[PDB]
Design a protein around this ligand. Structure first.
Ligand SMILES: CC[C@@H](CO)N1C(=O)[C@H](CC(=O)O)O[C@@H](c2cccc(Cl)c2)[C@H]1c1ccc(Cl)cc1
Length: 88
C-alpha cells in the first residue's frame, strides 16, 4: 500500500456514511485517511477486534460482505471499502 492512497478523496455511499456518522462529523467528501481512521475507531469502540475482526454481528458485516476479516490483509480491506464509496 503506497502512502499516497491516504490522500484519495471519496464520497461514501449511504451505508458507509451511516457507519461513519456514529464516530465522526458528517460531511460529503472524506479522505481515505479519515475513512480508515473512523472505521478503525468504530471497530475498537464496539470491540469487534480482539488478528481477526468479527462483524457478522454488526452493520460492518453488511458493509464489507464478510462475517470476519484479518486486520493485516490491507489490500482486501481497501477493496471492501471501495465498493462502498465513490472516488472524486
Ligand atoms: C482495527 C484497529 C485499527 C487501529 O488503527 N487498525 C489496525 O489495528 C491495523 C494495524 C495494522 O495492521 O497496521 O490496521 C489498521 C489499518 C490502517 C490503514 C489501512 C488499513 Cl487497511 C488498516 C487499522 C484499521 C483501520 C480500518 C480498518 Cl477497516 C481495519 C483496520
Amino acid at each position: 500500500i503506497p502512502a499516497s492512497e491516504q490522500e484519495t478523496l471519496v464520497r461514501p455511499k449511504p451505508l458507509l456514511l451511516k457507519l461513519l456518522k456514529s464516530v465522526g462529523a458528517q460531511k460529503d467528501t472524506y479522505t481515505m485517511k479519515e475513512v480508515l481512521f473512523y472505521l478503525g475507531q468504530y471497530i475498537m469502540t464496539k470491540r469487534l477486534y480482539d488478528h481477526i475482526v468479527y462483524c457478522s454481528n454488526d452493520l460492518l458485516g453488511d458493509l464489507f460482505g464478510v462475517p470476519s476479516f484479518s486486520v493485516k490483509e490491507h489490500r482486501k480491506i481497501y477493496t471492501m471499502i471501495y465498493r462502498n464509496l465513490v472516488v472524486v
